[PDB]
Amino acid sequence: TDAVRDPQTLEILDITPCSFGGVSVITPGTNTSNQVAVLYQGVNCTEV
Amino acid sequence: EFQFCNDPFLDVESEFRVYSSANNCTFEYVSQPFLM
Amino acid sequence: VNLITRTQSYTNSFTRGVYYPDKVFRSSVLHSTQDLFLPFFSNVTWFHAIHNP
Ligand SMILES: *[C@@H]1O[C@H](CO)[C@@H](O)[C@H](O)[C@H]1NC(C)=O
Numbered sequence: 001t002d003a004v005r006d007p008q009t010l011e012i013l014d015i016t017p018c019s020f021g022g023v024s025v026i027t028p029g030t031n032t033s034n035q036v037a038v039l040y041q042g043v044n045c046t047e048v
Numbered sequence: 049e050f051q052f053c054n055d056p057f058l059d060v061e062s063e064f065r066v067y068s069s070a071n072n073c074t075f076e077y078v079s080q081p082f083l084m
Numbered sequence: 085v086n087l088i089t090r091t092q093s094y095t096n097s098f099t100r101g102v103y104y105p106d107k108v109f110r111s112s113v114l115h116s117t118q119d120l121f122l123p124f125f126s127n128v129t130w131f132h133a134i135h136n137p
């Protein structure tokens with residue numbers, strides 16, 4: 001289901017699932033450091 | 049529950065020759081015409 | 085009263101009789117529908133009524 005007409009007022013709107021994706025953790029060896037980076041895959045960085 | 053003649057046709061303005069007698073109905077619908 | 089006479093001929097339906105099966109919008113898609121359709125290139129009785137019919 002991509003488009004729906006509003007029952008109250010006849011206007012065609014698009015319903016789309018909003019931001020979602022996978023999360024990857026980039027880390028060095030846990031003995032080297034505990035700092036990590038996070039890669040939110042497939043999403044624009046304004047969404048997160 | 050109409051009973052019609054063996055050759056039903058509309059008179060136009062009336063509907064006498066189509067069905068001889070009318071009795072208990074079950075549905076009705078009045079809307080904008082099909083044929084323009 | 086009886087005043088109507090019918091004459092029967094036969095013609096070809098070609099590709100006439102396709103309708104929208106459901107009121108679900110679909111754009112740029114090939115969709116398969118199993119429904120009661122008029123078969124393509126079918127013999128369609130052409131009746132002339134001049135005034136058991
Ligand atoms: C991602 O966001 C940036 C923010 O500046 C924007 O310029 C870019 O067009 C966006 N890309 C997509 C695919 O939304």
Ligand SMILES: *[C@@H]1O[C@H](CO)[C@@H](O)[C@H](O)[C@H]1NC(C)=O
Nearest residue numbers: 093094095096097126127128
């Ligand atoms: C089938 O259609 C053709 C073309 O209209 C016609 O000549 C033929 O008689 C038809 N056959 C019957 C009897 O259904």
